[PDB]
Amino acid sequence: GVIESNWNEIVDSFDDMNLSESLLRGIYAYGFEKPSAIQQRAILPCIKGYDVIAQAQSGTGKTATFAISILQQIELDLKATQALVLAPTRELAQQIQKVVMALGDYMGASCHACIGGTNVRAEVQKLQMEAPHIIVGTPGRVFDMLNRRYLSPKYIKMFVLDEADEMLSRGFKDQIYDIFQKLNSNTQVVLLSATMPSDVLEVTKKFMRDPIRILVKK
Numbered sequence: 001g002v003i004e005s006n007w008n009e010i011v012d013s014f015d016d017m018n019l020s021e022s023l024l025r026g027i028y029a030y031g032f033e034k035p036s037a038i039q040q041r042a043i044l045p046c047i048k049g050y051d052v053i054a055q056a057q058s059g060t061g062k063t064a065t066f067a068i069s070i071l072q073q074i075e076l077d078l079k080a081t082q083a084l085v086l087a088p089t090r091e092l093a094q095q096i097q098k099v100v101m102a103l104g105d106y107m108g109a110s111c112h113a114c115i116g117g118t119n120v121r122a123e124v125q126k127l128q129m130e131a132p133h134i135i136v137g138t139p140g141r142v143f144d145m146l147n148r149r150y151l152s153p154k155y156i157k158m159f160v161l162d163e164a165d166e167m168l169s170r171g172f173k174d175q176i177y178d179i180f181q182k183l184n185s186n187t188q189v190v191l192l193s194a195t196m197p198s199d200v201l202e203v204t205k206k207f208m209r210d211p212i213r214i215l216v217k218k
């Protein structure tokens with residue numbers, strides 16, 4: 001499916017987005033000059049705390065979009081997890097972790113990937129030590145970390161579902177809904193997907209209030 005935009009305000013410069021100086025320094029150091037189409041439309045509503053549905057393809061700069069929005073909202077001196085990002089695969093979770101860490105390098109933001117597998121015991125030990133500002137992971141592993149009390153939902157105020165169509169195709173619906181039940185019902189939710197079938201749209205109905213809708217056409 002394809003959504004209908006209800007938001008088409010353009011901010012054509014990162015300098016006009018009221019971002020923190022250290023975050024702006026990270027954006028330019030990453031290689032960005034001018035915001036991409038999705039960045040021009042989605043960063044501002046995301047930072048302002050609205051629920052957002054974004055339909056956008058690969059290669060659009062959509063990863064940096066939600067990473068910038070999360071990093072702008074983090075309270076850096078609160079040593080607790082404040083944002084949770086779900087991805088369908090370990091590779092995308094790791095891609096996101098590295099985007100976030102690069103964009104946040106001048107800020108001292110921390111981001112851990114929760115993916116399990118080869119090095120899972122180092123993953124869980126790092127959590128007992130200090131709670132990272134941002135967690136990104138696949139839904140089964142993240143749900144397990146919440147259920148086992150390694151991750152606290154107490155300070156999680158942002159919840160991002162990236163590649164939502166693929167997450168549902170891979171069988172993660174139950175875990176996504178169980179995660180959402182664990183989080184404060186006052187969490188902002190942002191959902192990004194290249195396609196918007198009925199199953200993805202029901203997540204938005206269930207999790208979001210009157211969301212901003214942004215379509216970046218291919």
Ligand SMILES: C[n+]1cc2c3c(ccc2c2ccc4cc5c(cc4c21)OCO5)OCO3
Nearest residue numbers: 036058059060061062063064091095096099
């Ligand atoms: C596909 N992409 C598009 C991007 C993009 C950007 C900025 C960065 C990325 C990016 C960064 C890391 C990546 C890492 C990846 C990847 C894809 C990307 C990737 O696939 C395998 O591992 O502005 C336009 O669109």
